[PDB]
Ligand binder design. Structure first.
Ligand SMILES: NC(=O)c1ccc[n+]([C@@H]2O[C@H](COP(=O)([O-])OP(=O)(O)OC[C@H]3O[C@@H](n4cnc5c(N)ncnc54)[C@H](O)[C@@H]3O)[C@@H](O)[C@H]2O)c1
Ligand SMILES: Nc1ncnc2c1ncn2CC[C@H](O)C(=O)O
Ligand SMILES: [Cl-]
Lengths: 496, 493, 493, 495
């Protein structure tokens, strides 16, 4: 059932995956505790969960936790390069989940895999096609294919034909659509022809989505302000134990791993430009400085720019340092941060990489299609592009995809356990409140966050890993600072 | 002879990494530009025993462009980058005996093969190298032990019984490296017992790369047993204060990130030895949030660690609570099987020193009832049967930055190897001064500060460094020449 | 397992009746409409021991639509309606072990089978239910007596003596229900002596339907021996004040009309017990002209009967003159063999309490030389040899409304069963809060007044009830919320 | 006896005899008559044909007539009211020759009645004759006799089978009821066997005693038109019959009929009782007894006010047809509930009749409505669904008297009171037989039993319920102007 239906690279790699999961668990005490505490009561019993999140060894422990808490699971990765095949094999081999993921997927297969993960069959009702009850999303692709599907079906009924926007290679104003959109549209057209009520049919049983990253939250917020969000949502990224640990300390280590694997050069003494000084950019700069690099920051936000200056970093606009810098790292969550025109001005063998969720930060398409460009594969997922006029080259790590997961194996278990403990709590919250979702009356959905009580709980579960000894307030002390001995200890607007 | 590498087809990826790497190896690039026409090393036979990385192939390419004939092998069983080896053979730069994941027996055969040259006058007769590039002293050791073997072979006119026994002087099992070296020596005594002493007539010197190899040279020098001139490359300022410190700062982290799946942040990481290597390791580990705890025998180095805010303890007081252990002492028996049994569940262990001796890997592997599983390529989890607790060892205790990663980056290696080429050029030009006819003793010397500063000058443009020029009056005030040297001989930088 | 019922071909009749019944079971209809998609009981395994009537079939259907997997049996040998059981099996709504006119032996086997679940992981292993819907407490009893048996079994490493004997502690013959339960318990000790205790880990609660079952839960709670959380459904206002009262007002009459051919008008009919059931019985009997005489032990209840114009006497003073006797006490030995021997020729006897213990049927059946004839299905005339006098007993003293008729009608059962579904949802939603690690003590609780009023709201439309709404000023004056609850916790309605 | 009888199953006999003995504990009037007259046998030699629901209670009536010396033939007066174990008991003991079973077709009903009226000549094997006396309930036995006589006169007048017997329509061109077509089918058949059959029975017919209101109505109509062909006794209007059986009997048996046929709770429901006469009064009382909200319909202003005095709403069917839950007809009239009323009722409304005939409800109109879907809910209970509205109504036992169609009728006590009147009426008719002159006058009347006998029936049942009657002193008897032994009330007293 699980092996037949799953689509993975190689099932024989399962044991390596299982051994790694067990080693990782020494530090993932949040997930370990959740399994110990809830594997019998099963708070997610009966829930069909579709996950779209980089299928790493850390993610396998997340999936395992969901499974032990009673859920059935279908999973895919949210990036073509991030899957670790031995982690994927472990899940399939142990019948923990039906998996559709492998390292180095074509963009076409990426969308087929996501759609496959969203496609369920109900054994209690003639194996009728249905959707998930809950979604674990990272970047919003699962949430996007649902909403774009609903949109495609409404447009389909309106004129009783395939929408024209799904059959063209151009967008609203003559520009070539990204390959990801063309590949998603190809799947949406394929599903309209099979059943044009598919996506709307899924809304009946869908009780929520828990989003992992900043870019996904951005997408959720935009839908919410337009009144187009079709299901409840929990913003996992903005938990303190997520955004202030994963985004920061996780990248501090994983960026370096990615650069070490993709870039052969010494980082020490190099001028490295970190574009964006947010939670991710802060961790990146700290890591880079930690190994002797001279970090130059770019920012649009005056507060973040000043914070960078307070840490001793030069803050410049890209145009003033593009011709002189050695390495460029985008961490903005924005688009067109590094253009082809910027690339043409870079010094010989300047390295370029992105750590934001999507490749849009760098004009990778513009570079690959530059007339007369020459490309060489330096190593797996590292390419050198040479311009014909100047004969100068630039080296791009993993086609602009998040470098820590494209050129390395992402953040280590400890911080992923903090992030994933929030995910499990979010999934439990959405499932346990499923009765309160009413579509025949309200229809308007919102984005929320987990309570500070839970947020603090995530931190408590990981203290023993590092031998942290916490102090306990006396009754008189608690009253003095106006808090309960058991927390929460900070006001809702506290920034840590 | 015919090169022995893993796969010749990897050559293009190797040549391509060499060209990228050269963007930063301006020392070697300059030496090639300046000396490729005059070829100051023309006619020289050079045998090298040094981790065959991409950075090393640029060193080999540089020795080749300067006119030397070359034979090479790696000085560790796991440090060879196969594509780098392939690039060298593909362009006939050198005859190579190297591949990643060699057995100890094959390591010694490769080395022996790299030292074997054929007579440029005759054909059927054998000879040795003129110059040696060594890292750790293994090429130098086999030469000396070979001579020592041939001498005692003639005296008692039979195979010396220490080459046939597996136990040492104290009845304890010899290391696999010694047994495999002794196996090779026995074979050469039967094939030709004048081989090692035959090489002495044409040996003009050795240039040693690392602290541990220099230690071996100094011991042979004090006993009056050194058989050729030697240049200590490790102790150039542009080698010891850059490669050992800043190179490890980045390469230890690379090795740990590849071998150890866990987060270093917040972990109590013990760095055993706070010398040039240890200092760099500590700095890197701190750079990614680790809590570094240092062990030392030298009260000066211990105070230095404390001045950078590090706790300084004895291993026995922290072995049960620490998370990761990193040996950087260049000593032996620093981590014992008894230390390992007291470690917490899934504690990580690794060595960055030149030899595996720092950790008792043999005692671990041969512990009664031990259970071992391969976590990934060159990472093993050992589980003790009495406690059911496990420890994870990176690459069987071999230098972790080259066993689980690709070693230091090109910039610092270019500085280290620029010193190697200059040392080779020095030994070669001074060959007439080596007089064998009268048993004169040989010595260990270092490169001049003039050349040491030169190495630094050649790499300033890589990082956009702008040097200030002294005025004539300023130069006089501090009593130096405008062109250097700028510091007295005992300056520590 | 495969269901064990009388006849699957009766399914269509059952399905039609269920559909007609739903016209009045608007509590269950609404729960299905509102929760069939979200499924608040999804994945829960529910075992039910409750008279399998058409009304119960709609309860089961409701639990199923809300997501549970279900196994069901009846809590009386005569109460199952075969067409109701067939409907459930035909539609795959539940696995059923029930049929009308079961032997006492088959009754305990059916209950035991209903409690047995195939483990979804290891198809070759057994497990128990997560939740239990009980009526009278036999499911709860067999579980607790099972645990007791296994503990006593390991304590002396042999089958406990009390399970292998036909006598009770005082040498008196055990009731057939106990002998048959014990038979099953001995059979399970030999198969798997960890069965019952193994079920506890996944047991989150029991919701109890009737007064007698609640008494049993209350005794276990005070002794500290209750093994799972419990919800007392009987004592919801929308249950005890409707089903027990008005349900019996109609179903007692239906039972009597089917079993007793004689006219009720003018007869002296003794109603033993004037509680919630007796009150309804008395009202129905006098509604068709009978002269009701009440017996009571409670002075308050006795006064209430007197206030409704009924004579209140002790059984002895009227046993020789009364025509019909109806027990509604929930007690035992209310009608003894000696009472029966003093009754007039052709006196009728029936019980409406949960268990047959109210009448000494065993003593009657085993009276020496007693003659018995079957008047009709489940109606027997016993003739004493010494007096030649006869008494006519309805369905061997089993609850007459369900033994000689089809029990209460759908409207009140919907009110009772809507309470059952809410209790099950409550127990399932808070399953994570149950813990057996800390070795905790379990309790009996009741549903809130908010939910109790909601049950009533769900049934107002059935009868065209137009409810008045409080103004904001009125609500403040009587100190309540416009949306209720409207009465304090101790309010008696 | 066992030779001719047509019943379902003789093996049910033991259960029937056993129920008879249990029933007799309360049927003290019948037990007393048997004890007083089994030796003198006042009905000795009388041939009695009965058409009255063959229940256990009726078996006791037949046993009583048999003990009193009569030869008996019996059938039921409804296709669903027979209890098979009761019929079997009579056949096994040779008490009577029986033609009756539960769930007869309408064709079989009339054949059974015709067979119960046919007697073999006591002085000849070959020839056939009629009964001496008739015990009738609803008037069907009486009807077939008169219609038979009418059909014989018509047959001889035009020397051919009367054309109203061959067609299946009435004067208006409307389809005849199935009971009329099947009766005519039998009357046509008998003209071809013996066209003097019915007139030949007159010679020996000494009278009929009628049980129910509807049968009496039929008798009163024949009497007023000068067409009654034999003396008749109105049993329905004895005080110990109409004020007990009709009222208290239905109070219990309507409920038993409803509880068996209708799965729903009666409490709180709006239940319409159409007709508030002796039957309706008892019905309303029983329904209220179990919490129903009774709504009464009436054409009689006196009866309507009576219902209002007991707290019942009085409405016209049209004003409540859309909101009521259950409808019970107790009028003895026709077309009280039409198809159009049925089409307006709420989803799953229940409909039933307790009057003697199904005519009160347009059952034929419902069954033949175009596109109607019908399903059997249980034995004798059907759900009918309309195609345009998709709404349904559930009819109990095709509109036949519900207490006997869906249950087993009144209990023994009141039936004993009704049947003690029947036995007394049979004795009176038989004892006065020589006062019937067929040669002289063909002017027959309907009379009732005297108040003395009426009070006697009540006396015979007082001990069943431990009733203690007070005795008048001589001075008290003179003061209220009655005899110490009754009668105690004037003839017009209404009780
Ligand atoms: N047949 C049904 O459908 C049905 C429905 C509901 C409840 N029940 C059962 O009916 C029984 C009574 O239920 P209830 O809710 O009326 O209980 P209750 O406690 O309200 O009433 C029982 C009454 O019996 C009286 N009593 C006890 N022992 C007596 C004795 N020896 N003599 C006289 N009176 C005595 C008590 O004083 C009490 O008032 C229980 O067994 C219950 O489970 C049956
Ligand atoms: N990249 C490297 N190539 C060759 N040798 C390397 C590299 N990184 C570290 N080493 C080890 C040499 C170093 O100078 C030492 O002394 O051990
Ligand atoms: Cl839940």
């Amino acid at each position: 059932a699980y092996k037949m239906e799953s689509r993975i690279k190689d099932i024989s790699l399962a044991e390596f995956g299982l051994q790694d999961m067990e080693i990782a668990k020494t530090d993932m005490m949040g997930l370990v505790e959740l399994q110990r505490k809830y594997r019998d009561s099963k708070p997610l019993k009966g829930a069909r969960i579709t996950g779209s999140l980089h299928l790493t060894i850390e993610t396998s422990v997340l999936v395992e936790t969901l499974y032990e808490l009673g859920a059935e699971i279908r999973w895919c990765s949210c990036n073509i390069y991030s899957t670790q095949d031995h982690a994927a094999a472990a899940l399939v081999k142990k019948n923990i989940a039906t998996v559709f993921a492998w390292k180095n997927e074509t963009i076409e297969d990426y969308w087929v895999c996501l759609n496959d993960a969203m496609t369920w069959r109900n054994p209690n009702d003639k194996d009728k096609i249905c959707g998930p009850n809950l979604i674990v999303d990272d970047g919003g692709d699962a949430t996007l294919i649902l909403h774009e599907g609903v949109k495609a079906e409404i447009e389909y009924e309106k004129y009783n034909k395939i929408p024209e926007y799904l059959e063209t290679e151009l967008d609203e104003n003559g520009k070539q659509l990204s390959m990801d959109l063309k590949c998603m549209y190809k799947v949406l057209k394929m599903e309209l022809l099979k059943n044009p009520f598919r996506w709307r049919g899924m809304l009946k049983d869908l009780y929520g989505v828990s989003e992992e990253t900043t870019t996904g939250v951005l997408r959720l917020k935009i839908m919410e302000s337009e009144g187009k969000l079709l299901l409840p949502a929990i913003n996992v990224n903005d938990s303190v134990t997520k955004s202030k640990f994963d985004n920061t300390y996780g990248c501090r280590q994983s960026l370096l791993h990615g650069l070490f694997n993709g870039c052969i050069q010494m980082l020490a003494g190099k001028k490295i430009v970190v574009l964006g000084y947010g939670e991710v950019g802060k961790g990146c700069a700290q890591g880079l400085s930690g190994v002797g690099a001279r970090v130059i920051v770019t920012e649009i936000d005056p507060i973040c720019a000043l914070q960078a200056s307070m840490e001793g970093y030069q803050v410049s606009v890209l145009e003033d340092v593009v011709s002189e810098a050695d390495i460029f790292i985008t961490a903005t969550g924005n688009k067109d941060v590094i253009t082809v025109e910027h690339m043409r001005k870079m010094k010989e063998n300047a390295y370029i990489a992105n750590i934001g969720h999507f490749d849009d930060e760098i004009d990778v398409y513009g570079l690959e299609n530059y007339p007369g460009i020459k490309v060489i594969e330096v190593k797996q997922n590292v390419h050198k592009f040479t311009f014909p006029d100047t004969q100068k080259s630039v080296i791009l790590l993993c086609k602009g995809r998040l470098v820590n997961l494209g050129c390395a194996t992402g953040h280590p278990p400890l911080v992923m356990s903090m992030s994933f403990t929030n995910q499990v709590l979010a999934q439990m919250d959405l499932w346990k409140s499923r009765e309160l979702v009413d579509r025949s009356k309200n229809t308007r959905f919102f984005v929320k966050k987990l309570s500070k009580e839970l947020d603090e709980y995530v931190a408590r579960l990981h203290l023993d890993v590092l031998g942290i000894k916490l102090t306990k307030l006396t009754e008189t002390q608690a009253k003095y600072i106006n808090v309960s001995i058991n927390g929460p200890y900070k006001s809702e607007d506290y920034r840590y």
